[PDB]
């Protein structure tokens, strides 16, 4: 993991939820999604020209969504249709991601966590279905799919498991890769 896993951030990021939890869209596009410390952005009508490779997107149950144009994903939560979010590798080795509004937790701190998933301990109320954008189920878990190692090559050592999620009333049987 060249300069990727060395100093991303602790899995127990400091600060907690001071009170009510809000919805925020900080439009976070600074660096590649090397680790789970990221803030995706909502992208509407996209130019389906530079997109290359699979465009798997996470319902969470991953589904291949081919662009409806050649030389389009209006992100919405499954209760309102569509998918939570997803990522793609395009152009010259540049990886990009998109997802619902990055879920922020009301609190104080120099580096308060812009919770993209789970983060229950920092905020007892943070459920994936309401506070999640990308494929990270928990700060140390992923939804394993064939291109998972092509998108996050720093998650080789993780072990696979079979899990049953319940989003609303719908039941998702899925494999998830987590370490120990």
């Amino acid at each position, epitope marked *: 993991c060249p300069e990727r896993m060395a100093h991303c951030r602790p899995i127990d990021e400091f600060a907690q939820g001071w009170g009510p939890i809000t919805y925020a869209e900080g439009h976070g596009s600074d660096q590649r999604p090397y680790c789970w410390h990221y803030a995706p952005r909502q992208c509407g009508t996209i130019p389906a020209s530079q997109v290359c490779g699979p465009v798997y997107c996470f319902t969470p149950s991953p589904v291949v969504v081919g662009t409806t144009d050649r030389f389009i994903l209006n992100n919405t939560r499954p209760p309102q249709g569509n998918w939570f979010g997803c990522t793609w590798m395009n152009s010259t080795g540049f990886t990009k991601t998109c997802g619902g509004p990055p879920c922020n937790i009301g609190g104080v701190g120099n580096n308060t966590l812009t919770c993209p998933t789970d983060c229950f301990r920092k905020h007892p109320e943070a459920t994936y279905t309401k506070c999640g954008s990308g494929p990270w189920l928990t700060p140390r878990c992923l939804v394993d799919y064939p291109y998972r190692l092509w998108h996050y090559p720093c998650t080789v050592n993780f072990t696979i498991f079979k899990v*049953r*999620m*319940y989003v609303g009333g719908v039941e998702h049987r899925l494999n998830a890769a987590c370490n120990i």
Partner: antibody, heavy 123, light 106 residues
Framework: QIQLVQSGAEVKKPGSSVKVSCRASGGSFGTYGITWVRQAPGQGLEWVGGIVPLFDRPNYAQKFQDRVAITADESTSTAYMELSSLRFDDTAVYYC????????????????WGQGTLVTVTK | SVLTQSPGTLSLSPGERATLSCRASQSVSSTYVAWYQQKPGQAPRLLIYDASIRATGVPDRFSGGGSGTDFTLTISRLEPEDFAVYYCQQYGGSPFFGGGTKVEIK
């Protein structure tokens, strides 16, 4: 798969809090869930709650919310259940069982159980 | 009152048949049911999960079944060591146990 369920508080007082422990010997702690189910002297079993100590988010039944907490210490491979605001109806035996499969937001069936710890509430 | 067992208390003698019933109220439940057994004091045991899959260590006498609703646990060739208080629970998204029949083998 030997649950040396440690006795908690055999005798308690109304309005007090009770911590019940459950120790898992062998296996890999942090991959299978621990579930707490209680049964009164003569009644049916009641699902108190459960936890999976890898997705840090315990599950509680509908009628045991805002009054029960569940924690898991992986460094010592133990699972604790803290029940507050005890009532004279709480007199029962609390078991500790293993979830067969990992579930998020749901429950599962219990494979191997453990010795029950009596919990007597009296004045 | 979601899951209930009609027969309530029961009493038979060895070499007989008992057919306990667990009546899921409204939802088909997607075929998620489990059956247990509780001796007079010992810990419960798991007999059937999914109503059609048998665990390890229990004989084939405990044959369970059901489709959509009204899952059943058929006990054939009753033995003296079959007295218990059987239980039925449905897991998944709506976890809840059921009523306890009171087989009275003698």
């Amino acid at each position: 798969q030997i649950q040396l369920v440690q006795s908690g508080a055999e005798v308690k007082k109304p309005g007090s809090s009770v911590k019940v422990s459950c120790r898992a010997s062998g296996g890999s702690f942090g991959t299978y869930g621990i579930t707490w189910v209680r049964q009164a002297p003569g009644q049916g079993l009641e699902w108190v709650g459960g936890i999976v100590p890898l997705f840090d988010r315990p599950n509680y039944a509908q009628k045991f919310q805002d009054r029960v907490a569940i924690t898991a210490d992986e460094s010592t491979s133990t699972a604790y259940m803290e029940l507050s605001s005890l009532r004279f109806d709480d007199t029962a035996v609390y078991y500790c069982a293993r979830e067969a499969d990992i579930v998020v937001g749901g429950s599962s069936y219990f494979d191997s159980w453990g010795q029950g710890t009596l919990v007597t509430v009296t004045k | 009152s979601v899951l209930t067992q009609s027969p309530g208390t029961l009493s038979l003698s060895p070499g007989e048949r008992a057919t306990l019933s667990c009546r899921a109220s409204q939802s088909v439940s997607s075929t998620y049911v489990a059956w247990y057994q509780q001796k007079p004091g010992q810990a419960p045991r798991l007999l059937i999960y999914d109503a059609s899959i048998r665990a390890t260590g229990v004989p084939d006498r405990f044959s369970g079944g059901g489709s959509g609703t009204d899952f059943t646990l058929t006990i054939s060739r009753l033995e003296p060591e079959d007295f218990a208080v059987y239980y039925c629970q449905q897991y998944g998204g709506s976890p809840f146990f059921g009523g306890g029949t009171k087989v009275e083998i003698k």
